Write a protein that binds this ligand. Structure first.
Ligand SMILES: *[C@@H](C(=O)O)[C@H](O)C(=O)N[C@H](C(=O)NCCCCCCCCN)C1CCC1
Length: 212
């Protein structure tokens, strides 16, 4: 795999979103990977509905949080609608998939990256954007305004994001805190420190959708 990957340069990444006060990071994370894999396989970049996952993933807990892998499972079982058909409201409501017509996209499954393994995550990122989790509770993360982020942070992962690239010394992350945070909404987190958990626990739990 190459020294640099940046799925934004391949046109596989939609604009940065703001999840708002809702604990919907798991759905935003999942949607990034869906937008990525659909562009990679079909050549079309579309935005898909975080709200639908928020409303419809019965294994997750809406704005109280949830699981990227569950959301990715739901898109593989059922599918997902376009974002403009099912826009983000920042509150869990009832699942309205059936009221909004045919699904716009569907994946074929979800795979987990081997945890605690930097190389395994990089390999997945070279193939497509990946859902990853990190510890975002620390003030250093929240106040990040740019640069390669080294912490401080623990490994109490609490925030799902999407890895959309990497470089020799970093993994490039699309956050869901709007364009005012970090580097136009992105963070570069140091890699290669030999910490098996990754910086801020970044290697704890990573998933990506499969689309044949
Ligand atoms: C992330 C965000 O910033 O929006 C959001 O908090 C999240 O999904 N985090 C997530 C998580 O904590 N998952 C478990 C939620 C349990 C809620 C329990 C509700 C019932 C209680 N009786 C994980 C993936 C990122 C860390």
């Amino acid at each position: 795999i190459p020294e640099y990957v940046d799925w934004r340069q391949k046109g596989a990444v939609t604009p940065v979103k703001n999840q708002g006060s809702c604990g919907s990071c798991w759905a935003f994370s999942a949607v990034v990977t869906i937008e990525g894999i659909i562009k990679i396989r079909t050549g079309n970049l579309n935005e898909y509905s975080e709200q639908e996952l928020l409303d419809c993933d019965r294994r997750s807990y809406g704005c109280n949080g949830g699981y990227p892998w569950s959301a990715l499972q739901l898109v593989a079982q059922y599918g997902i609608h376009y974002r403009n058909t099912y826009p983000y409201e920042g509150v869990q409501r009832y699942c309205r998939s059936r009221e909004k017509g045919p699904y716009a996209a569907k994946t074929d499954g979800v795979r987990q990256v081997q945890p605690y393994n930097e190389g395994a995550l990089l390999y997945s990122i070279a193939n497509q954007p990946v859902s990853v989790v990190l510890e975002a509770a620390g003030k250093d993360f929240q106040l990040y305004r740019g640069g390669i982020f080294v912490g401080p942070c623990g490994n109490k992962v609490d925030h799902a994001v999407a890895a959309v690239g990497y470089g020799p010394n970093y993994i490039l992350i699309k956050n869901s805190w709007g364009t005012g945070w970090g580097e136009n909404g992105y963070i570069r987190i140091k890699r290669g420190t030999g910490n098996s958990y990754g910086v801020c626990g970044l290697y704890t739990s990573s998933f990506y959708p499969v689309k044949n």
